[PDB]
Design a protein around this nucleic acid. Structure first.
Ligand SMILES: Nc1ncnc2c1ncn2[C@@H]1O[C@H](COP(=O)(O)OP(=O)(O)OP(=O)(O)O)[C@@H](O)[C@H]1O
Ligand SMILES: [Mg+2]
Length: 109
DNA sequence: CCCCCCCCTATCGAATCCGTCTAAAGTTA
């Protein structure tokens, strides 16, 4: 319906319209960089601006609950350790799909 | 006590008439 498209457009806006770091957790494989490039072109036309906006987007793959927990705990630890600094922090993190990695566990007794 | 789905079938039933054309052959004082 709309979930991945809305997430991608919001991430593109936050990465370009505010100049902040954003992490994306893609689990179902629903993230193509061509869509992000199209959205950025729809926003602005400078190539270096698009490259800099893309450099603030980090994508990680986690196809089960354990990998997702590992990457989230790694982010927690690194941010809690890096509280002294004031640059490169992540303000928005998007999980592409939580049902993908949770549904296999459920079902039964 | 907990959380998610399935599938097509089978033929029926007849109606309605129209429009005319072509003449030929003399006979017996
Ligand atoms: N130019 C375009 N590029 C990409 N998607 C487009 C475009 N124009 C329209 N769309 C729509 O974007 C939708 C993408 O769906 P999306 O992946 O965001 O939904 P979803 O609910 O998160 O899906 P899923 O359950 O498969 O993860 C398509 O249904 C398509 O109709
Ligand atoms: Mg999707």
């Amino acid at each position: 319906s709309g979930k991945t498209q809305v997430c991608l457009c919001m991430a593109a806006n936050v990465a370009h319209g505010l100049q902040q770091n954003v992490l994306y957790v893609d689990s179902n494989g629903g993230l193509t960089a061509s869509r992000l490039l199209q959205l950025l072109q729809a926003k602005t036309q400078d190539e270096e601006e698009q490259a800099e906006a893309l450099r603030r987007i980090q994508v990680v793959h986690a196809f089960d609950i354990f990998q997702m927990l590992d990457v989230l705990q790694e982010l927690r630890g690194t941010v809690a350790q890096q509280v002294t600094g004031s640059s490169g922090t992540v303000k928005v993190v998007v999980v592409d799909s939580v049902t993908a990695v949770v549904s296999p566990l459920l079902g039964g007794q």
